[model samples]
Target: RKKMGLLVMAYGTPYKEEDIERYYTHIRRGRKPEPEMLQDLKDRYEAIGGISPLAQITEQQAHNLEQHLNEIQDEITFKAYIGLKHIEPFIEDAVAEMHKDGITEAVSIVLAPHFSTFSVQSYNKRAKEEAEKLGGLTITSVESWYDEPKFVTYWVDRVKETYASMPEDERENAMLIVSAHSLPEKIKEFGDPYPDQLHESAKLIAEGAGVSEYAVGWQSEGNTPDPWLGPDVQDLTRDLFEQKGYQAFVYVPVGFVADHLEVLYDNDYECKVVTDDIGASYYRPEMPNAKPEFIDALATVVLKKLGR
Candidate 1:
C-alpha cells in the first residue's frame, strides 16, 4: 500500500521585522534589490508590522483541508503539509520531510488560486525537482484549479455575502473591482494565461453574484525596470472615479487565498489611499481563510485526485 500526501505551496512572508531582507532576497532568487526599492518594500512591510501572516494562514488552510478530506473519505489516510516557496520551511525542506514521513505518492497544489507558467508553474518545477531528488515519491501536480466550479463558487459566496452585509444604498452605489496580483506586461506578449484566468475568475464571481458592473485591475508589481501587468489598481480606481463616477467600491482579491503583503500593502494601503484621494468609499472582500466552503472545495479536488 502506498501512502499519499497533499502539499499546499505558497509564497511565504517573514514573521519578524528583521527578517524582511532575507525573506525578500530568497524570493528574488539571488538577484539583488536596489537600495530605494528595498527601502520602499521595507517601509511597506514595516507598516504592517514588518511581517505578513500568510504562512500561518496557509498552514491553517492545509490543516483544515486535511480534516475535511478525512471527513469526506475515510478509506485513504491523507496527510497535508505546507511548503513555502520563498521563506522558512521551504519547498525542498518540506518535500524532504514528506519523504521521511513515508509519503510515496504526492500531489502539489499552489495556494495561488489562479496560475501562469511564470507564477504557479515555477512552483510545479521546483517541487518536481525536489521530489525527484528524493528518488522514491511519485508526484502528481494539480495545475491551476482556478476554473473548478466549486472553487469559483467559494469565491462567489464570499463576495456576495460580503456585499449583502452592506447597507442597501451602499450596495447599490458600489462598483465592483476585481483585483489580482500583477505579472509583467511581457507575459501578455508571450501569451501567458494568467490575465485570462484572472478575468475568468472575476467574471464567474460576478455572474454568480448576478452583478454586471465591474472592472478587473492589477496590483503588486515589482520594482523592476520592465513594465508589469496593468491597468494598475490605483490608476484604475482613479479612472473609475473620474470617468465612471462611482462613489462606492467593492474589491475582490480573486488571485490570493489569504491576506499577504500584496493584499495588505498593495491593495489595503496604496489602493485605499487612492480611493480616499478620489473620495470613493472602498471595501475589500475578506480573504478565504479556512472557510468551510473553501475547505470543502479543496477536499472535493483531493477526493477526485484519489479517484473517489
Candidate 2:
C-alpha cells in the first residue's frame, strides 16, 4: 500500500503564559508587539481561561481525520501532521518532517472553511514553498471546504439545535445572527470570495435549518486602521435589539471550526456583553470541537481529495 501525509494547518495558539510573547512575535513576523498591546492580548487570553485550546483542539482534529482516513481506505495509508501558522511545528517544519519521514505525497487543508487570497491562499503559498524547497513532497492543498456537503450539514444541525433551545415564550423575539472572522475591507478590491463564501454558507445553514429570518455579521476584526468587514457582531446585535425589537440572539460562529480566542473572547465574552448591555439575551451552541460529526465532515474533504 502507498502512504500519504495529511498536513492540517491552523492559526496556532500559545500553549501557556510564557509562550505568549513568542507567539505574538511570530504573528507579528519577527517584530515585537508594543508592551501595552502585548498586555492587552494577554488579558484577552486570561479572560478566556489563560490560554486558548486551539493547539490541543487542532491536534485532536488531525488525529481524528487521520484515524477516519485509515479506517475508510486500505490502498493508501494516511498519516496526519499539524502545521500551525504562528507557532511551533510551523507549516514549513511540518513539510520538512514529512520529507524526513519519507512521505513524498500529501494532501493539505487549512482548518478554516472559507477561502481568501489573504487566508487559505497564504497557507497554500507557504506549503508550496516548503515543498519546492524539499523537492520531493507533492502537496495538493484543498483550497476551501466551505461548500462541502457534510461541513454544511454540521453547521445546519447546530443551528437547528441552538435556535430550538431558546425558551418558547421568548423564541418569537429571538433572532439568528451568523458570524465569521473579518478580513480587511481591502480584500474586496480584488473581488475576494471570503465575504461571499461566509454569507453563502450562512444562507445555506440558515435555510437548511429552516430558519426564515437571520442576519450575518463579521467578528474579531484586527486592530488595523483600514476598514474590515462589517456590520460588526456588536453593531448588529445592538441594532437588532434597538431597531428591530429582537431581544434574544442565537449566534453561530460558523467561520471557526473550534473554540479559541475568537470564539471564546470575541463571541462568548465580547458579543455577549454587547447583548447584555442592550438588555437582550445571547446564546450559541458549543463549538464542533472533536465532535464525531465534525470529524466526518473533515474526513469527507480528505476523501474527496484522494478521490476515494
Candidate 3:
C-alpha cells in the first residue's frame, strides 16, 4: 500500500531557444530581464548550442538512479522524478505527482553536493511547502554528501587524466585551479558553511590527485554589488599568468556535479577567453554527468538514506 519516490532536483535551464525568456524571468525572480541582460544570457546559450541540456541530463540521472536502485534491491519499488527550481515540471509539481501516485514516503536529493541555505535548503523548504498543501506525504531529504569517497574519486581520477593530457613540457609548469559557484559575501557572516565546505572538498580532491601546486577561486558570481567570493577565477588565472608565471592550467570545478551553463559558459567560454588573451592554454576535465561511477555514488547516497 506504499511506494518510495526519489525526488531529485536541480536549478533548471531553458530547454531550447524559446524557453530562454521565461527561464531568465524565473531566474530574475519574476522581474523581466533587461534587454541587454536577456541578450547576454541568450548569447551564453548560443555559444553552447542554443540550448541547455540541463533538464534532459537531470532527467537521465533520475532514470539511471531508479533503474540502479531497482536492480540492486530486487524487492524495492522505486520511482524517480526530477524537479527544477526555475523551469517546467517544477519542484512543487514533482511533490504533487508523488502524492497523487500514493507515494507515502519520498527521498529527495538535490543534484548539487555543496550545502547552502540559499541552495539546498531553499529546495527542501519549497518541497515542504508543497507537501503541506498536498497533505499526507512524508519527505526525507539528504542535505549534503559532498565528502563521499566515491564522489571524490570522480574528481581525483578526472584531474589525473586531464593533468596527464597536458603537453609534457606544460605538465610540470601547469597549476590546477579548483572552483565553486560564488555566493554573496554575507553568507560568511550568516554562518553558512558553503565556502568552507568547498575548500574542504577541494582539499580532499587535491590530496587524491596528488596535486601539489594548485589554487582556489570562485565562479559564476550572480549580479550583485555586494562583494561575492574571491578571487574571481579570471583574476586568479591572470595572477597565475603574471605573478606565478604558469602558462598552462587545468580547471577543476569541485562544486558542480553536472554540466550546465556555469561550466559550459562561465568556465569554458569566458575563462577560456581570459586564458587565450593571456597567451595561455586552458584545460578542464569533463563533468561526471551520469557516468557509471558517479551514478553509483549517488545511488549509494540514496540507498544509505533508505537503509537498504
Per-model lDDT: 0.81, 0.87, 0.86
lDDT of 3 by residue, 181-266 (tens): 89888878879999889888888888999998888899988778798888899889988889877879789888887778899888
Best candidate, lDDT: 2
Poorest lDDT segment (10 consecutive residues) of candidate 2: 46-55
Per-candidate Cα RMSD to the true structure, in Å, reads 2.2, 1.4, 1.6
Candidate number that wins on TM-score, 1 or 2: 2
Clashing pairs in 3: none
Comparing 2 and 3 on lDDT, the stronger one:
2
- When 1 and 3 are scored with TM-score, the better candidate is 3
lDDT of 2 by residue, 184-225 (tens): 899999999998998898888889999888899999887677
Could you tell me which 10 consecutive residues in candidate 3 have the lowest summed lDDT? 47-56
lDDT of 1 by residue, 97-168 (tens): 899998988888888778788878888898889889888987788777777789888778877887788888
Give me the displacement of residue 26 in model 2, in angstroms: 2.5
Clash totals, every prediction? 0, 0, 0
Candidate 1 segments whose C-alpha is farther than 4 A from its true place: 31-43, 49-52
Rank order by lDDT, top first?
A: 2, 3, 1
